[PDB]
Amino acid sequence: EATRRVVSEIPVLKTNAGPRDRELWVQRLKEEYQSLIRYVENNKNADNDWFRLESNKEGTRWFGKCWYIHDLLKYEFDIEFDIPITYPTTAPEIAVPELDGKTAKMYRGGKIKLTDHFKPLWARNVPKFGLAHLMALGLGPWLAVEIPDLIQKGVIQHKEKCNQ
Amino acid sequence: ETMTEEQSQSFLTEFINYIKQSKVVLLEDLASQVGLRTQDTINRIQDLLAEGTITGVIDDRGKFIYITPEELAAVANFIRQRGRVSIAELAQASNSLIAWGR
Amino acid sequence: NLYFQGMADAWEEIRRLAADFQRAQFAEATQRLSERNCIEIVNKLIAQKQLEVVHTLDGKEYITPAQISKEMRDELHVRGGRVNIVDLQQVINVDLIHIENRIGDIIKSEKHVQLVLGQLIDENYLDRLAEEVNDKLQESTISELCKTYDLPGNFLTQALTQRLG
């Protein structure tokens, strides 16, 4: 469905290697940043900038922010993930800690829980999907369902520096 | 609490001034300059647009854009040039069809 | 062992690319309007009678009446001079009323096209029918042909009247 459009715009990756491949990880990391850059540029070019991100010096730890807009209002959540040893075969697990307890589609630790459709698709495309594809096909669709829902259940509330 | 008819009206003055100086207004900055919730600033501005007192659009992210009549004209021509055009080819075109500044 | 040829150069590129990823995120976004806002404008233009435009059935596109007239002629051009009016809905993805509202123009204006029973037929179509029909005359019953081409007699006659020769 829609997927196809976002997928198409993101560059595929090639190196099948994870953090403990002495020789090939740095080549996978090069591919990770390149795709990421291109996704962000794409996101800026359309007026659709929905996140910020940073890594540790080895690209094994990642941390940042995302935001969702609902009824003209912005909700902003901190996020982070560690690259597994079995990456890129195994997909990394994104954590939004601030919603821990507050949403059913999430494990303890803030570890979000995706649809059943994600894993099979990740797996049939190994090693072409990377972090850009994670953001695009995992977190974002997760926000597009959970955030509206938590808002209408009063589980979350917009936050201005302020008072009526 | 809710705004005296007097206070309501310094709202509109502030707003006009921002539009006159910037053309595009971020509603969280308007809200802050007037000391209102973005929520209520937006809702107020929705009523003004309904009254016809104000002319413009609020994008999905809550930025306000005043569109000039020469712009409205250009949009009309652009649709007529194209004959058939998708709403998304429009949204794309808006970057060039509209000024984002004074 | 611990060093591999290129490792240094590779991590230098990562120093570069990571700095680009920050620069890219700090860059301002190209501004665009919501699709809703584009609709909002078009709805005003319509009110101010400054624009006449119809939407597609999937509500994804806008089309002017003149573009409809044009895409109508295109299908005729494609289909070869005989097209059913009913199929143009699907072809153009607009309600049939919007198509029907342009038929007056198509006929009068172009003068090249006529209307028969829910179908538009043009000079070309007939010219080429005549050819095939000559291919009976010099080799061999409008009655029959009217049935062979599912065309009303009144019409085909008048049309056949001005072809012979």
DSSP per-residue string spanning chain C? ----TTHHHHHHHHHHHHHHHHHHHHSPPPP---HHHHHHHHHHHHHTT----EE-TTSSEEE-HHHHHHHHHHHHHHHTSEEEGGGHHHHHTS-HHHHHTTHHHHHHHHSSEEE-SSEEEEHHHHHHHHHHHHHHHTT--HHHHHHHTT--HHHHHHHHHTT--
State this model's resolution in angstroms.
2.6
CA distance C128 to C135: 11
Given strand B63-65, what is the order of strands in its sheet? B24-26, B63-65, B57-58
Strand-strand pairing, A61-70 and A73-82:
antiparallel
Measure the CA angle with vertex A132, ends A128 and A137; round to 5°.
85
Residue A163 covered by a domain:
no
Residue A74 covered by a domain:
yes
Does residue C72 share a domain with residue C53?
no
> Measured in whole angstroms, how far is the alpha carbon of residue B53 from the centre of its chain?
12
Does residue C153 share a domain with residue C102?
yes
Residue C77 covered by a domain:
yes
Q: Does residue C44 contact residue B72 with C-beta atoms inside 8 Å?
A: yes
In this structure, what CATH number is given to the domain that contains residue A14?
A: 3.10.110.10
Closest CA of chain C from A58, distance in Å: 9
Chain B residues closer than 8 Å to A160 by CB: 28, 31, 37-39
Does residue C80 share a domain with residue C49?
no
**C 30-49: CB under 8 A from B:** 30-42, 44-45, 48
Chain C residues closer than 8 Å to B58 by CB: 37
CA distance C108 to C164: 25
Q: Which of C17, C46, C63 is the last residue of a domain?
A: C63
Residue C78, exposed/middle/buried by CB under 10 A (0-12, 13-18, 19+)?
A: exposed
Does residue C133 share a domain with residue C120?
yes
What residue spans of B23-86 are helical by DSSP H?
27-34, 38-51, 69-82
> Measured in whole angstroms, how far is the alpha carbon of residue A79 from the centre of its chain?
8
CA distance C106 to B73: 28
Residue C26 covered by a domain:
no
Q: Does residue B39 contact residue A158 with C-beta atoms inside 8 Å?
A: yes
The closest of C115, C71, C145, B83 to C79, measured between CA atoms, is C71
Q: Which of C63, C81, C107 is the last residue of a domain?
A: C63
Q: Does residue A142 contact residue A112 with C-beta atoms inside 8 Å?
A: yes
CA distance A66 to B19: 30
Does residue C77 share a domain with residue C151?
yes
Write b or e for each residue in A131-146: b if 16 or more Cβ atoms lie within 10 A of its Cβ, otherwise e.
bbbbbbbbbbbbbeeb
Report how far apart, in Å, the C-alpha atoms of A18 and of each of A47, B78, C60, C75 are: 33, 51, 43, 56
Residue A139 covered by a domain:
yes
CA distance C79 to A103: 57
Set out the domains of chain B in order of their start, with CATH numbers: 5-65 (1.10.10.10), 68-102 (no CATH)
CB atoms within 10 A of CB C60: 12
Partner chains of B (3+ C-beta pairs under 8 Å)? A, C
Report how far apart, in Å, the C-alpha atoms of A155 and of each of A67, A99, A163, B46 are: 17, 9, 20, 26
Residue C44: domain span: 32-63
Give chain C's domain count. Answer: 2
Q: Does residue B101 contact residue B23 with C-beta atoms inside 8 Å?
A: yes
Q: Are C21 and A33 within 8 A, CB to CB?
A: yes
CA distance C78 to C93: 17
Does residue C79 share a domain with residue C39?
no
- Written as six digits, the tokens of C134 are 């000559």
Chain B residues closer than 8 Å to C31 by CB: 24, 94-95, 100
H helix or E strand, kind and range, residue B5? helix B5-22
Does residue C59 share a domain with residue C87?
no
What residue spans of chain A are helical by DSSP H?
3-9, 25-45, 118-124, 131-134, 140-152
Q: Does residue B64 contact residue B58 with C-beta atoms inside 8 Å?
A: yes
> Measured in whole angstroms, how far is the alpha carbon of residue A112 from the centre of its chain?
10
Q: Are A46 and C7 within 8 A, CB to CB?
A: no
Would you call the peptide bond into A88 cis, given omega within 30 degrees of 0 as the criterion?
Answer: yes
Helix (H, G, I), strand (E, B) or coil at A78: strand
CA distance A119 to B3: 53
Does residue C149 share a domain with residue C77?
yes
H helix or E strand, kind and range, residue B17? helix B5-22
Query: Among B76, B83, B91, whose Cβ lies nearest the Cβ of C70?
Result: B83
- Written as six digits, the tokens of C106 are 């198509």
CB atoms within 10 A of CB C39: 17
The closest of B91, A55, A101 to C22, measured between CA atoms, is A55
Q: Give the CB-side neighbour count of residue A80, counting CA atoms within 13 A.
A: 10
Q: Which of C40, C63, C86 is the last residue of a domain?
A: C63
Experimental method: X-ray
**DSSP per residue over A51-75, as a string?**
EEEEE-TTSSEEEEEEEEEETTEEE
Residue A135: domain span: 3-152
- Written as six digits, the tokens of A105 are 């589609």
Residues 6 or more apart whose Cβ sits within 8 Å of residue C118: C84, C85, C86
CB atoms within 10 A of CB A21: 14
CA distance A56 to A18: 15
Report how far apart, in Å, the C-alpha atoms of B44 and of each of B6, B23, B31, B37, B64 are: 14, 18, 10, 10, 12
Residues 6 or more apart whose Cβ sits within 8 Å of residue B90: B75, B78, B79, C33, C35, C38, C62
Closest CA of chain A from C30, distance in Å: 5
Residue A5, exposed/middle/buried by CB under 10 A (0-12, 13-18, 19+)?
A: exposed
Give chain A's domain count. Answer: 1
Residue A89 covered by a domain:
yes
CA distance B56 to B71: 11
CA distance B77 to C45: 11
Report how far apart, in Å, the C-alpha atoms of A47 and of each of A53, C33, C39, C163 are: 18, 8, 17, 61
Q: CA end-to-end span of chain C, whole Å?
A: 95
Report how far apart, in Å, the C-alpha atoms of C8 and of each of A23, B73, C58, C110 are: 11, 58, 55, 73
Helix (H, G, I), strand (E, B) or coil at B83: coil
Can you say whether the dihedral through the CA atoms of B34, B39, B41, B44 is positive or negative?
Answer: negative
Q: Does residue B97 contact residue B78 with C-beta atoms inside 8 Å?
A: yes
Report how far apart, in Å, the C-alpha atoms of C73 and of each of A52, A147, A150, C106 are: 51, 49, 52, 8
- Written as six digits, the tokens of B38 are 């973005």
Does residue C140 share a domain with residue C84?
yes
Does residue C69 share a domain with residue C58?
no
- Written as six digits, the tokens of A36 are 């990421």
Residue B30, exposed/middle/buried by CB under 10 A (0-12, 13-18, 19+)?
A: buried
Residue A20 covered by a domain:
yes
Report how far apart, in Å, the C-alpha atoms of A151 and of each of A75, A156, B62 are: 10, 5, 17
The closest of B38, B10, B58, B27 to A164, measured between CA atoms, is B38
- Written as six digits, the tokens of A153 are 């259940």
- Written as six digits, the tokens of C4 are 């591999």
Mutual orientation of helices B38-51 and B27-34 as an angle, nearest 10°? Answer: 100
Q: Are B39 and A158 within 8 A, CB to CB?
A: yes
- Written as six digits, the tokens of C115 are 């209307």
H helix or E strand, kind and range, residue A81? strand A73-82
Residue A158 covered by a domain:
no
Backbone angles phi, psi at A58, to 5 degrees: -105, -5
> Which residue matches tokens 């910037």?
B22
Residue C130 covered by a domain:
yes
- Written as six digits, the tokens of C149 are 């081409």
Residue C4 covered by a domain:
no
